[model samples]
Target: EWQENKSWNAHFTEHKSQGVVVLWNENKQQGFTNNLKRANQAFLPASTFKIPNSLIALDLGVVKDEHQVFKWDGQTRDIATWNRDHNLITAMKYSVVPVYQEFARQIGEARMSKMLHAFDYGNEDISGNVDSFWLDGGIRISATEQISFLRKLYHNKLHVSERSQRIVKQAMLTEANGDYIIRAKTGYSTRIEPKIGWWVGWVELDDNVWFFAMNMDMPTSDGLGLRQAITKEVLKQEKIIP
Candidate 1:
């Protein structure tokens, strides 16, 4: 599932403390050898939770399409002071908070909860009531659980209808940056406090597909910083970009 820099097989020998490098190309699956060696545990979903929320939003018509213009509030709400004005597509592109919160408002708590359940997310306690803090402590799952959740998304197993599933898949593909179709969302978990970074997405290379989710915690700088570095490194190794 992973490769380590301790050996010559690693792409980034400098970052010897690197955690894990997970990837799946057209030919085979590869990940970094466990450098962190962290045990199985549930991590704070962070912003990576947005992927599921995006799927739920798409299914419930909360998001009409990638082009659906959701207005933005240009105020600095959090420590990172991250702000944005965007559509569904751009929201993910920039990881804007106001844009995402607005989308949540549009979806409303009632519908959001319903869609979460429909996706087989979690129970009322875990899924939250849209008004509850479930969005933060909403759902908890291990890395293995995260992979399983993604498999269902890929297979269209987590939705109320086939049409909803197809639409989400299409939206994700359309919002991606390049030839490899990707369906993903990034999120951070914070409450008027600091941000925790999260990066999650799936890649499709011709006939092959891969799903991944990542996170970063507090007092460690922005999570996206780490995620972006990891993604860029992986893409470079795959010749996806220069």
Candidate 2:
């Protein structure tokens, strides 16, 4: 069900030749990729780790539910939406770091480490500061690994409780563009350069879902857009979307 193709190589080359994508097409029962080795190479997960972290928070009761609210501390941030009160859904929608960092601090090292191990998460290492390990610290995962984890989530294959899975999936929903409902997360690791940019998510079709994970090196912030751009281009090329 898996294969690698160069059909999308030009898209990456157009940027900086440092991008990769892994996709699973349920309708066709096929998997496709570009830069196969990089797809399996682990890098800092950045906020993409939030998908599992959200499940962890929900399962551990650290967060009662998506509707539970957290008031913002009076701190200014580069992203304006993050500087106010938020609940689980809003925090995820905005990719607000402070809220999730608070959740991590509350979740603590022991529980976090326990869950990561249970999930056999990438590298399974949270050795640095609890709040930032997935971002600036030791944790890392590859685009392929990302799809594997996401597959577990999509199929409710993870050991976490079903309610946790349901809520996290709901929280992950992004938008409906025409007939396709896109549910995904974008992560950028600014701690390194060329920085890592990620757009990992799936497109829901009328009868099936196509999942994707993309990551690339971004010498500057401009490379961030390439993550989604390349993914969308490939999706269209594969005829998974119009």
Q: What are the lDDT scores of the predictions, listed in order?
A: 0.54, 0.87
Which regions in candidate 2 have their CA more than 4 angstroms from the true location?
A: 27-29
Instruction: Give the TM-scores of the predictions, in the order they appear.
Output: 0.66, 0.95
Scored against the true structure, residue 160 in model 1 reaches a CA lDDT of: 50
Q: Please, what are the lDDT tens digits per residue for candidate 2 over residues 109-221? A: 99999999888889999989999898778888988888888888888889899899999999999879768999899998888544888999889988999999998877777
lDDT of predicted model 1: 0.54
What range of 10 consecutive residues in model 1 has the weakest lDDT sum? 32-41
Model 1: how far residue 186 lies from native, Å: 3.0
